[PDB]
Design a protein around this ligand. Sequence first.
Ligand SMILES: CCCCCCCCCCC(CCCCCCCCCC)(CO[C@H]1O[C@@H](CO)[C@H](O[C@@H]2O[C@@H](CO)[C@H](O)[C@@H](O)[C@@H]2O)[C@@H](O)[C@@H]1O)CO[C@H]1O[C@@H](CO)[C@H](O[C@@H]2O[C@@H](CO)[C@H](O)[C@@H](O)[C@@H]2O)[C@@H](O)[C@H]1O
Length: 225
Amino acid sequence: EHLRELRYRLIISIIAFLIGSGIAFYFAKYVFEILKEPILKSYPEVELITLSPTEPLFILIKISLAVGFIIASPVILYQFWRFIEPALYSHEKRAFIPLLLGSILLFMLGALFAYFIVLPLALKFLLGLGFTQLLATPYLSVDMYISFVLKLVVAFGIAFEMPIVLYVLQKAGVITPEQLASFRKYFIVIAFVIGAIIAPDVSTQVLMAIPLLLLYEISIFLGKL
Ligand SMILES: CCCCCCCCCCC(CCCCCCCCCC)(CO[C@H]1O[C@@H](CO)[C@H](O[C@@H]2O[C@@H](CO)[C@H](O)[C@@H](O)[C@@H]2O)[C@@H](O)[C@@H]1O)CO[C@H]1O[C@@H](CO)[C@H](O[C@@H]2O[C@@H](CO)[C@H](O)[C@@H](O)[C@@H]2O)[C@@H](O)[C@H]1O
Protein backbone atom coordinates (compact mmCIF):
# COMPACT_ATOMS: atom_id res chain seq x y z
CA GLU A 1 0.00 0.00 0.00
CA HIS A 2 2.73 2.55 1.15
CA LEU A 3 4.81 1.07 -1.75
CA ARG A 4 1.93 1.64 -4.27
CA GLU A 5 0.79 5.08 -2.84
CA LEU A 6 4.12 6.69 -3.88
CA ARG A 7 4.04 4.95 -7.33
CA TYR A 8 0.70 6.84 -7.96
CA ARG A 9 1.32 10.15 -6.12
CA LEU A 10 4.57 10.41 -8.16
CA ILE A 11 2.68 9.96 -11.50
CA ILE A 12 0.05 12.58 -10.40
CA SER A 13 2.88 15.04 -9.50
CA ILE A 14 4.76 14.23 -12.80
CA ILE A 15 1.42 14.59 -14.74
CA ALA A 16 0.93 18.06 -13.08
CA PHE A 17 4.51 19.21 -13.84
CA LEU A 18 4.10 18.47 -17.59
CA ILE A 19 0.65 20.23 -17.69
CA GLY A 20 2.36 23.18 -15.93
CA SER A 21 5.39 22.96 -18.28
CA GLY A 22 3.14 23.08 -21.36
CA ILE A 23 1.41 26.25 -20.07
CA ALA A 24 4.89 27.77 -19.40
CA PHE A 25 5.87 26.83 -22.99
CA TYR A 26 3.02 28.80 -24.58
CA PHE A 27 3.71 32.14 -22.73
CA ALA A 28 7.53 31.51 -22.63
CA LYS A 29 8.42 34.55 -24.81
CA TYR A 30 6.85 36.82 -22.19
CA VAL A 31 8.55 34.87 -19.25
CA PHE A 32 11.88 35.36 -21.17
CA GLU A 33 11.16 39.17 -20.84
CA ILE A 34 10.71 38.98 -16.98
CA LEU A 35 14.00 37.12 -16.78
CA LYS A 36 15.89 39.56 -19.12
CA GLU A 37 14.45 42.57 -17.11
CA PRO A 38 16.99 42.66 -14.13
CA ILE A 39 20.07 43.05 -16.42
CA LEU A 40 18.26 45.11 -19.14
CA LYS A 41 17.58 47.87 -16.59
CA SER A 42 20.59 47.80 -14.21
CA TYR A 43 23.47 47.33 -16.79
CA PRO A 44 21.97 48.36 -20.20
CA GLU A 45 25.53 48.67 -21.64
CA VAL A 46 25.73 44.82 -21.26
CA GLU A 47 24.58 43.07 -24.45
CA LEU A 48 22.75 39.73 -24.27
CA ILE A 49 24.10 38.00 -27.41
CA THR A 50 23.43 34.32 -28.33
CA LEU A 51 27.03 33.01 -28.40
CA SER A 52 25.30 29.58 -28.67
CA PRO A 53 24.82 28.39 -32.38
CA THR A 54 21.12 27.94 -33.13
CA GLU A 55 19.99 27.21 -29.53
CA PRO A 56 17.17 29.68 -28.50
CA LEU A 57 14.97 26.54 -27.97
CA PHE A 58 17.31 25.21 -25.28
CA ILE A 59 16.68 28.59 -23.47
CA LEU A 60 12.94 27.96 -24.16
CA ILE A 61 12.95 24.34 -22.87
CA LYS A 62 14.88 25.54 -19.71
CA ILE A 63 12.22 28.35 -19.26
CA SER A 64 9.23 26.01 -19.95
CA LEU A 65 10.63 23.39 -17.49
CA ALA A 66 11.60 25.69 -14.52
CA VAL A 67 8.49 27.95 -14.70
CA GLY A 68 6.35 24.82 -15.34
CA PHE A 69 7.55 23.60 -11.91
CA ILE A 70 6.58 26.92 -10.09
CA ILE A 71 3.03 26.44 -11.58
CA ALA A 72 3.00 22.76 -10.35
CA SER A 73 4.60 23.65 -6.94
CA PRO A 74 1.10 23.78 -5.19
CA VAL A 75 0.19 20.23 -6.51
CA ILE A 76 3.70 18.81 -5.78
CA LEU A 77 3.67 20.35 -2.20
CA TYR A 78 0.26 18.60 -1.66
CA GLN A 79 1.45 15.15 -2.82
CA PHE A 80 4.40 15.42 -0.38
CA TRP A 81 2.23 16.67 2.53
CA ARG A 82 -0.50 14.06 2.02
CA PHE A 83 2.04 11.13 1.77
CA ILE A 84 3.47 12.19 5.15
CA GLU A 85 0.76 13.88 7.32
CA PRO A 86 -1.65 12.62 8.81
CA ALA A 87 -0.27 9.52 6.86
CA LEU A 88 2.87 8.99 9.07
CA TYR A 89 3.68 12.01 11.33
CA SER A 90 0.91 14.43 12.42
CA HIS A 91 -2.76 13.49 13.10
CA GLU A 92 -5.09 16.51 12.51
CA LYS A 93 -6.30 17.35 8.98
CA ARG A 94 -7.06 21.01 10.00
CA ALA A 95 -3.37 21.37 10.95
CA PHE A 96 -2.65 20.06 7.38
CA ILE A 97 -4.58 22.94 5.72
CA PRO A 98 -2.53 25.77 7.42
CA LEU A 99 0.54 23.60 6.67
CA LEU A 100 -0.23 23.37 2.88
CA LEU A 101 -1.06 27.14 2.67
CA GLY A 102 2.04 27.97 4.73
CA SER A 103 4.26 25.73 2.52
CA ILE A 104 2.60 27.04 -0.73
CA LEU A 105 3.47 30.62 0.31
CA LEU A 106 6.99 29.62 1.44
CA PHE A 107 7.90 28.37 -2.07
CA MET A 108 6.54 31.69 -3.53
CA LEU A 109 8.43 33.82 -1.01
CA GLY A 110 11.56 31.72 -1.84
CA ALA A 111 11.39 32.50 -5.57
CA LEU A 112 10.63 36.27 -4.88
CA PHE A 113 13.67 36.32 -2.56
CA ALA A 114 15.94 34.95 -5.31
CA TYR A 115 14.53 37.19 -8.10
CA PHE A 116 14.37 40.42 -6.03
CA ILE A 117 17.26 40.14 -3.52
CA VAL A 118 19.82 37.39 -4.33
CA LEU A 119 19.93 38.11 -8.11
CA PRO A 120 20.33 41.99 -8.19
CA LEU A 121 23.00 41.50 -5.51
CA ALA A 122 24.59 38.70 -7.57
CA LEU A 123 24.78 41.11 -10.57
CA LYS A 124 26.53 43.97 -8.67
CA PHE A 125 29.07 41.41 -7.24
CA LEU A 126 29.62 40.20 -10.86
CA LEU A 127 29.54 43.11 -13.34
CA GLY A 128 28.78 46.12 -11.07
CA LEU A 129 32.13 45.95 -9.23
CA GLY A 130 33.41 49.34 -10.45
CA PHE A 131 34.82 49.66 -14.01
CA THR A 132 34.35 46.00 -15.07
CA GLN A 133 32.43 47.47 -18.10
CA LEU A 134 35.39 46.43 -20.39
CA LEU A 135 35.20 42.65 -19.50
CA ALA A 136 31.36 42.84 -19.70
CA THR A 137 29.92 44.33 -22.96
CA PRO A 138 28.74 41.84 -25.76
CA TYR A 139 30.32 39.38 -23.26
CA LEU A 140 26.98 38.03 -21.86
CA SER A 141 25.51 34.78 -23.32
CA VAL A 142 21.70 34.62 -22.85
CA ASP A 143 21.82 30.85 -22.19
CA MET A 144 24.28 31.63 -19.37
CA TYR A 145 22.24 34.45 -17.76
CA ILE A 146 18.74 32.79 -18.13
CA SER A 147 19.95 29.49 -16.61
CA PHE A 148 21.65 31.19 -13.60
CA VAL A 149 18.30 33.02 -12.93
CA LEU A 150 16.28 29.76 -13.28
CA LYS A 151 18.79 27.85 -10.95
CA LEU A 152 18.87 30.65 -8.34
CA VAL A 153 15.03 31.11 -8.49
CA VAL A 154 14.13 27.34 -8.16
CA ALA A 155 16.85 26.57 -5.57
CA PHE A 156 15.56 29.38 -3.24
CA GLY A 157 11.96 28.25 -3.64
CA ILE A 158 13.02 24.74 -2.42
CA ALA A 159 15.56 26.12 0.18
CA PHE A 160 12.64 28.00 1.85
CA GLU A 161 10.67 24.74 2.28
CA MET A 162 13.41 23.51 4.69
CA PRO A 163 12.12 25.24 7.92
CA ILE A 164 8.66 23.62 7.49
CA VAL A 165 9.69 20.04 6.59
CA LEU A 166 12.22 20.38 9.47
CA TYR A 167 9.87 21.91 12.14
CA VAL A 168 7.37 19.08 11.23
CA LEU A 169 10.07 16.31 11.50
CA GLN A 170 11.41 17.79 14.80
CA LYS A 171 7.78 17.95 16.17
CA ALA A 172 7.27 14.25 15.06
CA GLY A 173 10.57 13.57 16.90
CA VAL A 174 12.17 12.08 13.71
CA ILE A 175 15.13 14.48 14.33
CA THR A 176 16.14 16.47 17.46
CA PRO A 177 17.33 20.14 17.37
CA GLU A 178 20.70 18.93 18.74
CA GLN A 179 20.93 16.55 15.72
CA LEU A 180 20.75 19.61 13.40
CA ALA A 181 23.32 21.38 15.70
CA SER A 182 25.63 18.37 15.10
CA PHE A 183 25.11 18.37 11.28
CA ARG A 184 26.08 22.13 11.12
CA LYS A 185 29.69 21.27 9.99
CA TYR A 186 28.19 19.21 7.14
CA PHE A 187 25.46 21.61 6.06
CA ILE A 188 28.23 24.29 5.69
CA VAL A 189 29.70 21.94 3.03
CA ILE A 190 26.15 21.18 1.60
CA ALA A 191 25.49 24.99 1.20
CA PHE A 192 28.90 25.60 -0.40
CA VAL A 193 28.37 22.55 -2.73
CA ILE A 194 24.95 23.95 -3.84
CA GLY A 195 26.61 27.37 -4.13
CA ALA A 196 29.34 25.91 -6.35
CA ILE A 197 26.81 24.12 -8.63
CA ILE A 198 24.48 27.15 -9.26
CA ALA A 199 26.69 30.26 -8.78
CA PRO A 200 29.33 31.34 -11.39
CA ASP A 201 32.00 32.73 -9.00
CA VAL A 202 33.10 32.69 -5.31
CA SER A 203 31.36 36.09 -4.57
CA THR A 204 28.02 34.56 -5.66
CA GLN A 205 28.78 31.04 -4.20
CA VAL A 206 29.20 32.85 -0.80
CA LEU A 207 26.19 35.21 -1.49
CA MET A 208 24.08 32.05 -1.83
CA ALA A 209 25.52 30.04 1.04
CA ILE A 210 24.68 32.88 3.56
CA PRO A 211 20.79 32.65 3.21
CA LEU A 212 21.04 28.78 3.11
CA LEU A 213 22.89 28.56 6.50
CA LEU A 214 20.43 31.22 7.78
CA LEU A 215 17.51 28.93 6.70
CA TYR A 216 19.25 26.03 8.50
CA GLU A 217 19.63 28.14 11.72
CA ILE A 218 15.88 28.99 11.43
CA SER A 219 15.06 25.21 11.64
CA ILE A 220 17.15 24.80 14.90
CA PHE A 221 15.23 27.79 16.48
CA LEU A 222 11.99 25.99 15.42
CA GLY A 223 13.25 23.27 17.76
CA LYS A 224 10.41 24.22 20.15
CA LEU A 225 9.64 20.91 21.94
C1 LIG B 1 -1.79 29.25 -13.54
C2 LIG B 1 -2.02 29.34 -15.02
C3 LIG B 1 -0.94 30.12 -15.74
C4 LIG B 1 -0.86 31.58 -15.33
C5 LIG B 1 0.48 32.23 -15.62
C6 LIG B 1 1.01 31.99 -17.02
C7 LIG B 1 1.77 33.18 -17.58
C8 LIG B 1 0.93 34.46 -17.67
C9 LIG B 1 1.67 35.62 -18.30
C10 LIG B 1 1.19 35.97 -19.70
C11 LIG B 1 0.36 37.27 -19.86
C12 LIG B 1 -1.05 36.99 -19.33
C13 LIG B 1 -1.61 35.58 -19.52
C14 LIG B 1 -2.89 35.34 -18.70
C15 LIG B 1 -3.58 34.01 -18.93
C16 LIG B 1 -3.13 32.88 -18.01
C17 LIG B 1 -3.85 31.55 -18.25
C18 LIG B 1 -3.17 30.33 -17.63
C19 LIG B 1 -3.67 28.97 -18.15
C20 LIG B 1 -5.09 28.61 -17.75
C21 LIG B 1 -5.45 27.17 -18.01
C22 LIG B 1 0.84 38.45 -19.01
O1 LIG B 1 -0.27 39.23 -18.52
C23 LIG B 1 -0.05 40.55 -18.06
O2 LIG B 1 0.71 40.58 -16.86
C24 LIG B 1 1.26 41.87 -16.52
C25 LIG B 1 2.76 41.78 -16.67
O3 LIG B 1 3.38 41.22 -15.52
C26 LIG B 1 0.64 43.02 -17.30
O4 LIG B 1 -0.64 43.38 -16.78
C27 LIG B 1 -1.08 44.67 -16.45
O5 LIG B 1 -0.80 45.34 -17.65
C28 LIG B 1 -0.96 46.77 -17.60
C29 LIG B 1 -1.87 47.06 -18.77
O6 LIG B 1 -2.08 48.46 -18.92
C30 LIG B 1 -1.54 47.13 -16.21
O7 LIG B 1 -1.78 48.54 -16.10
C31 LIG B 1 -0.45 46.76 -15.16
O8 LIG B 1 -0.99 46.96 -13.85
C32 LIG B 1 -0.16 45.23 -15.29
O9 LIG B 1 1.23 45.19 -15.65
C33 LIG B 1 0.65 42.80 -18.82
O10 LIG B 1 1.78 43.44 -19.41
C34 LIG B 1 0.67 41.32 -19.15
O11 LIG B 1 0.03 41.09 -20.41
C35 LIG B 1 0.23 37.69 -21.32
O12 LIG B 1 1.36 38.42 -21.74
C36 LIG B 1 1.93 38.18 -23.00
O13 LIG B 1 1.26 37.15 -23.71
C37 LIG B 1 1.82 36.92 -25.01
C38 LIG B 1 1.18 35.66 -25.55
O14 LIG B 1 1.94 34.50 -25.26
C39 LIG B 1 1.62 38.15 -25.88
O15 LIG B 1 2.19 37.94 -27.18
C40 LIG B 1 2.96 38.94 -27.81
O16 LIG B 1 2.27 40.16 -27.72
C41 LIG B 1 2.10 40.88 -28.95
C42 LIG B 1 1.60 42.26 -28.59
O17 LIG B 1 1.48 43.05 -29.76
C43 LIG B 1 3.43 40.91 -29.73
O18 LIG B 1 3.04 41.71 -30.85
C44 LIG B 1 3.81 39.49 -30.21
O19 LIG B 1 5.23 39.32 -30.08
C45 LIG B 1 3.22 38.37 -29.27
O20 LIG B 1 2.00 37.87 -29.82
C46 LIG B 1 2.30 39.36 -25.26
O21 LIG B 1 1.98 40.55 -25.97
C47 LIG B 1 1.88 39.48 -23.80
O22 LIG B 1 0.97 40.49 -23.39
